[PDB]
Amino acid sequence: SDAQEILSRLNSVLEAAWKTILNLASATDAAEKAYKEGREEDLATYLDQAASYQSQVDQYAVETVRLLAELKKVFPDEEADRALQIAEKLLKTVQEASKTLDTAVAAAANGDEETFAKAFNQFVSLGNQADTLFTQLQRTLTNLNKK
Amino acid sequence: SDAQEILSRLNSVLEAAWKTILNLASATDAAEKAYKEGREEDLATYLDQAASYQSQVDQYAVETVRLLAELKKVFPDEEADRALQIAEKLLKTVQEASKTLDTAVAAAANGDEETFAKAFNQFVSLGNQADTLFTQLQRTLTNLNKK
Amino acid sequence: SDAQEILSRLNSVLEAAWKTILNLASATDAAEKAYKEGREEDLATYLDQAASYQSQVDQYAVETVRLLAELKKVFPDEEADRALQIAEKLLKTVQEASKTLDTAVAAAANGDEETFAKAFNQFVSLGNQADTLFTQLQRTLTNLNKK
Ligand SMILES: NC(=O)c1cccc2cn(-c3ccc([C@@H]4CCCNC4)cc3)nc12
Ligand SMILES: NC(=O)c1cccc2cn(-c3ccc([C@@H]4CCCNC4)cc3)nc12
Ligand SMILES: NC(=O)c1cccc2cn(-c3ccc([C@@H]4CCCNC4)cc3)nc12
Numbered sequence: 001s002d003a004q005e006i007l008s009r010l011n012s013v014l015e016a017a018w019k020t021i022l023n024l025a026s027a028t029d030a031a032e033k034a035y036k037e038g039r040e041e042d043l044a045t046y047l048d049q050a051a052s053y054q055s056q057v058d059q060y061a062v063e064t065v066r067l068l069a070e071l072k073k074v075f076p077d078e079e080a081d082r083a084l085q086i087a088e089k090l091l092k093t094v095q096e097a098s099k100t101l102d103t104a105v106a107a108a109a110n111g112d113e114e115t116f117a118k119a120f121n122q123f124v125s126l127g128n129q130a131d132t133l134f135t136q137l138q139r140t141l142t143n144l145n146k147k
Numbered sequence: 148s149d150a151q152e153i154l155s156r157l158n159s160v161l162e163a164a165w166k167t168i169l170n171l172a173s174a175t176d177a178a179e180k181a182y183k184e185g186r187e188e189d190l191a192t193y194l195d196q197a198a199s200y201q202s203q204v205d206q207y208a209v210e211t212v213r214l215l216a217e218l219k220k221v222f223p224d225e226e227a228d229r230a231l232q233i234a235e236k237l238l239k240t241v242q243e244a245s246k247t248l249d250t251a252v253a254a255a256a257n258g259d260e261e262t263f264a265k266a267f268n269q270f271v272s273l274g275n276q277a278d279t280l281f282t283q284l285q286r287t288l289t290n291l292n293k294k
Numbered sequence: 295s296d297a298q299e300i301l302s303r304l305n306s307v308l309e310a311a312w313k314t315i316l317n318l319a320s321a322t323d324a325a326e327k328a329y330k331e332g333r334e335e336d337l338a339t340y341l342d343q344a345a346s347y348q349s350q351v352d353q354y355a356v357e358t359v360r361l362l363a364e365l366k367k368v369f370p371d372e373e374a375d376r377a378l379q380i381a382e383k384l385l386k387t388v389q390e391a392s393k394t395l396d397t398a399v400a401a402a403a404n405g406d407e408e409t410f411a412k413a414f415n416q417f418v419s420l421g422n423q424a425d426t427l428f429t430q431l432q433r434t435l436t437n438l439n440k441k
Binding site: 051 | 191195198199202205206209212213216235238239242245246249250252253256257258
Binding site: 166169170172173174176177180189192193196 | 313316317319320321323324327336339340343
């Protein structure tokens with residue numbers, strides 16, 4: 001059929017996404033420290049890195065939805081439907097995180113610390129919510145791969 | 148450092164951004180054609196290309212605001228302030244275009260054509276608005292490059 | 295060298311090539327539009343973009359020929375022999391397309407509309423020939439992959 005090839009591509013996308021997520025978390029740790037130390041040029045560099053990693057996570061989350069939508073067409077069963085539902089919620093959260101990080105990056109560039117700090121704290125909350133969904137998706141794709 | 152080094156960096160940034168904008172316009176034209184033709188995998192490819200170019204425009208728009216904020220610190224008048232205000236409005240519009248394109252990409256991945264079409268049409272309107280501001284910023288910067 | 299690793303690599307190469315072909319078609323659509331509208335600087339940019347994708351397609355065609363030759367040695371059967379023959383015809387055709395695109399670039403640079411129009415028309419014809427060959431190659435590789 002096709003399910004096994006799709007599942008293999010999904011494994012590769014999620015492994016790449018996890019590395020990118022680790023890089024995003026590291027860049028935002030560094031951004032937070034630069035903000036607290038008042039190092040504006042360092043902050044700008046780490047925010048730019050974070051934005052690049054966030055855009056890459058956005059792409060992988062879209063790819064994940066598309067692959068699971070294809071899986072459900074070729075292997076209809078509530079476990080694939082469940083994985084697709086989780087992936088769609090993850091993508092929604094990732095895009096919320098992305099828009100919020102964008103607001104923080106613009107506020108920092110505009111010299112607007114109040115909006116920066118509010119947006120940054122919102123981003124952290126959304127990133128943690130996305131991590132919960134990502135881990136849940138990973139668990140689910142073990143049913144489907146048969147550990 | 149000096150107002151001249153800054154203004155020359157800004158010219159390089161805007162030149163690069165214009166090339167990226169041309170590529171974004173071309174990718175979105177191709178997405179529209181694939182959408183009209185019902186070619187879903189082609190549409191996915193072109194939406195991903197569009198999102199990548201949009202991410203790059205976002206980065207250049209941030210860099211433009213940062214450079215004009217630095218120019219204003221170096222020679223504080225009202226011509227620098229006016230350019231910065233235009234660039235800040237451009238960045239806001241760019242980020243609105245980016246969030247709206249992201250919604251369209253997600254809707255397409257989810258097979259929700261109603262949301263896709265609404266978000267894609269909003270993206271086009273925002274893109275045209277951003278083009279107006281980009282051209283306005285370029286005019287303003289010519290009046291600053293006072294040889 | 296084993297048959298399955300080579301087929302795997304070929305599948306990846308052809309998927310990457312298809313995305314690049316989509317990008318080449320988009321850049322050439324944009325070039326045609328700029329030409330029709332008299333936007334000469336836009337045309338120049340889009341021709342440079344098209345040439346970049348054309349050079350990438352050329353390299354994927356080279357890689358495909360090399361890989362199919364390897365497949366014939368460790369996996370002799372007349373389908374791989376047919377695939378190599380198609381791939382070599384594709385490589386000849388994409389090189390001819392590259393030459394014609396080069397002529398279009400130089401004609402635009404010289405502002406020689408008569409030569410430009412002839413070269414661009416020839417490019418479109420060669421692009422359609424290459425598309426037929428690429429489709430045949432995809433079908434032959436599907437046959438080889440034996441599910
Ligand atoms: N932002 C995302 O799209 C995203 C997707 C999936 C898992 C994610 C995990 N994060 C995440 C990103 C950053 C952080 C914080 C921010 C700074 C403090 N320590 C790390 C915590 C979680 N972001 C994720
Ligand atoms: N989207 C942006 O951030 C952006 C920034 C600056 C100038 C811009 C110009 N555009 C733009 C992008 C796409 C389009 C249309 C929409 C699709 C079909 N024809 C091209 C029109 C304008 N987007 C821009
Ligand atoms: N040029 C190539 O090497 C090539 C290789 C494989 C498949 C291809 C398909 N094309 C192609 C490229 C461009 C076009 C037209 C020409 C411009 C207006 N509409 C798109 C039609 C087909 N080019 C291909």
